[PDB]
Amino acid sequence: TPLNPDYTFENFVVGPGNSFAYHAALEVAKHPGRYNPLFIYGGVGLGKTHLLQSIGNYVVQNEPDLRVMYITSEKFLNDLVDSMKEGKLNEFREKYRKKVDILLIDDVQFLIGKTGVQTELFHTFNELHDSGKQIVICSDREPQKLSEFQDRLVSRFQMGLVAKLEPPDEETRKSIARKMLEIEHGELPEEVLNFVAENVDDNLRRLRGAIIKLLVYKETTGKEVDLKEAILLLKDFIKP
Numbered sequence: 001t002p003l004n005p006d007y008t009f010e011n012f013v014v015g016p017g018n019s020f021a022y023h024a025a026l027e028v029a030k031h032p033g034r035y036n037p038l039f040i041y042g043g044v045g046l047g048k049t050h051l052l053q054s055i056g057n058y059v060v061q062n063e064p065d066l067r068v069m070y071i072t073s074e075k076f077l078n079d080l081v082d083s084m085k086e087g088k089l090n091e092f093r094e095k096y097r098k099k100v101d102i103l104l105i106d107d108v109q110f111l112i113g114k115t116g117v118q119t120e121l122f123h124t125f126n127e128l129h130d131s132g133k134q135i136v137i138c139s140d141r142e143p144q145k146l147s148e149f150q151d152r153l154v155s156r157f158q159m160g161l162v163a164k165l166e167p168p169d170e171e172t173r174k175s176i177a178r179k180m181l182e183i184e185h186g187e188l189p190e191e192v193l194n195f196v197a198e199n200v201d202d203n204l205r206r207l208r209g210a211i212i213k214l215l216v217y218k219e220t221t222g223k224e225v226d227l228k229e230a231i232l233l234l235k236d237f238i239k240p
């Protein structure tokens, strides 16, 4: 149960592009089991992971005694592979069903082609679901657009909530960048913050990247960040 201290509902700025996703997520965490399952989808750096673990953290705090499980489709892959090699299929099934009340799986696009794993995940889903265990799945693609995927699994993804994250607008981006700073206990000029939150618009992974890059500079160069200086430092965040 090692979740990220930052990935919480409170450090999530809401905006037209992520509002619905954020509420579904929050709602699911307030009533684990009521809406099974929750499948969040969106492109890179849009809050999937962050949102996914918030459900985790929120539940760890308001439902102290409740087995919460976060995981990457990839680990679900790597763990199975071993289950087969090491020979203990049980240990695996005990770990991902018998001993979980809430199961959060991130980046499911990793299972494309991996029909092997796809099959085992399928049942894990059904057993957890038939016993009211909350399931949440994050994907960089929507159920349909998920290539090389077992229809039965895919149709399992839809029988619940389906929310889509979309990149935020400039106004909302600046707010995210500001809340990003708090979390890093940093600080920047009200003209640098702007320039960054206005030109590092690919995704939020890079937005934070830049905001940290600068902080690292303000660490070494004890002086400070000058708008011009920032632009030199952030070359690879405007045209990668």
Ligand SMILES: Nc1ncnc2c1ncn2[C@@H]1O[C@H](COP(=O)(O)OP(=O)(O)O)[C@@H](O)[C@H]1O
Binding pocket: 006, 011, 012, 013, 014, 018, 043, 044, 045, 046, 047, 048, 049, 050, 051, 176, 179, 180, 204, 205, 208
């Ligand atoms: N709505 C948001 N409000 C504030 N910060 C956000 C928001 N969404 C994402 N972030 C920031 O971006 C990072 C998470 O990006 P992430 O969710 O992992 O991208 P992805 O969903 O593509 O994996 C976090 O560290 C967080 O600080």
Ligand SMILES: [Mg+2]
Binding pocket: 048, 049, 106, 107, 138
């Ligand atoms: Mg992710």
